[PDB]
Coordinates of C-alpha atoms and ligand atoms in Angstrom, one line a residue:
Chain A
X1090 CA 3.4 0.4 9.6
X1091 CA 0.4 1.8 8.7
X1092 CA -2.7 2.5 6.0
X1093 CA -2.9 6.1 4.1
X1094 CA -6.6 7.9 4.5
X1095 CA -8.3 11.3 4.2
X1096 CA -11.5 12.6 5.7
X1097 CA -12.2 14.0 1.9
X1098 CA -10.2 16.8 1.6
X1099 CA -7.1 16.0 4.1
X1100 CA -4.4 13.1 4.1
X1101 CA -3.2 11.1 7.5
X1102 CA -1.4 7.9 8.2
X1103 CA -3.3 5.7 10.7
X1104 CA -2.3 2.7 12.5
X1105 CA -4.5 -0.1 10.8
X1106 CA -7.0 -1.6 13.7
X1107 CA -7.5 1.6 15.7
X1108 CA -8.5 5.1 13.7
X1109 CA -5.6 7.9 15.1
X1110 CA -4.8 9.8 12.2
X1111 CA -0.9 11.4 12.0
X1112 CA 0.5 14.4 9.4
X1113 CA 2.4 12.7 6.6
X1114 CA 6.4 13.0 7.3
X1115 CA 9.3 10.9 6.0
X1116 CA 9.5 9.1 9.6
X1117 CA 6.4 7.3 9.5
X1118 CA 6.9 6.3 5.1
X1119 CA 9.7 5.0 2.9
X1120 CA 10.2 5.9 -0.8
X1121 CA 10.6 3.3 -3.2
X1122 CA 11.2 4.2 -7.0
X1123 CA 8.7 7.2 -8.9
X1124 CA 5.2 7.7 -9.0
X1125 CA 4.9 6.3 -13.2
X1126 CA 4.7 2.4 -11.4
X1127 CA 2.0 2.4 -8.8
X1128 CA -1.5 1.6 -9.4
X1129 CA -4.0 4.2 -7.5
X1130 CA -1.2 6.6 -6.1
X1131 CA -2.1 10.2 -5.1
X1132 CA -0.8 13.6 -5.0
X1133 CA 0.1 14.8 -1.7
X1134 CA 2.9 16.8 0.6
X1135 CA 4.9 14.6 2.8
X1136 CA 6.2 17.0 5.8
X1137 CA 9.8 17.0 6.6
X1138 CA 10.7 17.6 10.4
X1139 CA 14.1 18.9 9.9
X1140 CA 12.7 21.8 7.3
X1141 CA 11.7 23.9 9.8
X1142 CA 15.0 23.3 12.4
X1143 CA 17.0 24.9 8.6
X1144 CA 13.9 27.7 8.4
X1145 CA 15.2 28.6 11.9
Chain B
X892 CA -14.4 -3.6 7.0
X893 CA -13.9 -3.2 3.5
X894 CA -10.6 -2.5 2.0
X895 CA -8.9 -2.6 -1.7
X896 CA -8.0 -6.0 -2.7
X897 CA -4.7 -4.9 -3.8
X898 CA -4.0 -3.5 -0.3
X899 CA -5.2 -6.5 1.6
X900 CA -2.8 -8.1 -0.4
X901 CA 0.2 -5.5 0.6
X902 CA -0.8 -6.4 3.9
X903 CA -0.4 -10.5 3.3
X904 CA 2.8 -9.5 1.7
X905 CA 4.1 -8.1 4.9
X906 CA 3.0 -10.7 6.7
X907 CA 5.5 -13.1 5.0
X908 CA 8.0 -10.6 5.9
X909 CA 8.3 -9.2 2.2
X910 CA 8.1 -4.8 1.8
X911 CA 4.9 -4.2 0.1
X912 CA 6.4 -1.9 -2.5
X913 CA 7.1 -5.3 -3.9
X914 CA 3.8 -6.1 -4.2
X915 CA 2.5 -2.5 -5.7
X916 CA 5.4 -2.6 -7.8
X917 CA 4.5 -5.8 -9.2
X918 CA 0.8 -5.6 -9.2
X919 CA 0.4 -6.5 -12.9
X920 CA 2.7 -9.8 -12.4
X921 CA 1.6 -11.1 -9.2
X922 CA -2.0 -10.8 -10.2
X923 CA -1.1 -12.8 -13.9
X924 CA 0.4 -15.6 -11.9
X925 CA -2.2 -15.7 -9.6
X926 CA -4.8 -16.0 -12.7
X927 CA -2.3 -18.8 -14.2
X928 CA -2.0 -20.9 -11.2
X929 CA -6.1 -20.8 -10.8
X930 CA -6.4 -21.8 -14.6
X931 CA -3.7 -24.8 -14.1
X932 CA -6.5 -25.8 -11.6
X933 CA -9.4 -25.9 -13.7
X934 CA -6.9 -28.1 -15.9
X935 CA -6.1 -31.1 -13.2
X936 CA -9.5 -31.2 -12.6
X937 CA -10.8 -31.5 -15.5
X938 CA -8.4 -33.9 -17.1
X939 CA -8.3 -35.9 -13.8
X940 CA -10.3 -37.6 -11.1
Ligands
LIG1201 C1 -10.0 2.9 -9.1 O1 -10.8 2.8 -10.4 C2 -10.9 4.1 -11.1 C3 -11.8 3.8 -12.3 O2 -13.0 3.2 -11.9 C4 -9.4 4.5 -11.5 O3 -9.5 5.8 -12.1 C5 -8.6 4.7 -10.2 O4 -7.2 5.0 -10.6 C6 -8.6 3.4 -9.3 N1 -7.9 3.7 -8.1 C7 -7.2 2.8 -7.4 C8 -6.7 3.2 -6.0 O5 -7.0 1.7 -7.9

């Protein structure tokens, strides 16, 4: 529930009537299917908050 | 406030309670019918009154 944006050189998720920009994570997105479909998509790293609880 | 017209429409998609992967997934196919059903328009009111 949400828009994608970047500043330029940076990628957030923001809530869509109020600018608060978030880090990318797989709790605020979903994955459907592989990037070959989409019109427009982009690049980027999507953060995983469990990755650093196996780093530990 | 601008936006992508693609996007506004992932938007209208989840506000009929549809996932809007369905819409960027069929972008190409929503956007042809949409084209179609305009034309059929242009038809009835020409042939018509
Ligand atoms: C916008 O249009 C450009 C060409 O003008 C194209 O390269 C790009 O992939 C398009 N981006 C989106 C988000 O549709």
């Amino acid at each position: 529930e949400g828009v994608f944006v970047s500043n330029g050189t940076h990628w957030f998720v923001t809530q869509r009537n109020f600018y608060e920009p978030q880090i990318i994570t797989t709790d605020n997105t979903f994955v459907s299917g592989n990037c070959d479909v989409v019109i427009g998509i982009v690049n980027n790293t999507v953060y995983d908050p469990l990755q650093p609880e196996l780093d530990s | 406030l601008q936006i992508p017209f693609a996007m506004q429409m992932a938007y209208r998609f989840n506000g009929i309670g549809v996932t809007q992967n369905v819409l960027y997934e069929n972008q190409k196919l929503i956007a042809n019918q949409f084209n179609s059903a305009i034309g059929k328009i242009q038809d009835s009111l020409s042939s018509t009154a």
